[PDB]
Amino acid sequence: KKKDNLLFGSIISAVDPVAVLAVFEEIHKKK
């Protein structure tokens, strides 16, 4: 129970499949 810093989550946790798609699109394509 440490590291209370996570403000980034507000931004990262904001990401959505649509944002991950552009990436996950080149991944499953390389697999």
From Swiss-Prot:
Record PTM: O-glycosylated.
Show the stretches that span the lipid bilayer: 4-27
Q: What compartments host this protein?
A: Cell membrane; Basolateral cell membrane
In the record, the note on similarity to other proteins reads: Belongs to the monovalent cation:proton antiporter 1 (CPA1) transporter (TC 2.A.36) family.
The UniProt subunit note reads as follows: Homodimer; dimerization is crucial for its function. Oligomer. Interacts with CALM1 in a calcium-dependent manner. Interacts with TESC. Interacts (via the C-terminal domain) with CHP1; the interaction occurs at the plasma membrane in a calcium-dependent manner and facilitates the maturation, cell surface expression, and function of SLC9A3. Interacts with CHP2; the interaction occurs in a calcium-dependent manner. Interacts with EZR; regulates the cytoskeletal interactions of SLC9A1 and promotes stress fiber formation.
Additional notes on this entry: Predicted models used for more than 20 years predicted 10-12 transmembrane segments. More recently, the structure of SLC9A1 has been solved and reveals that SLC9A1 possesses 13 transmembrane regions.
Quote the disease note of the record: Lichtenstein-Knorr syndrome: An autosomal recessive neurologic disorder characterized by progressive cerebellar ataxia and severe progressive sensorineural hearing loss.
Protein known as:
Sodium/hydrogen exchanger 1
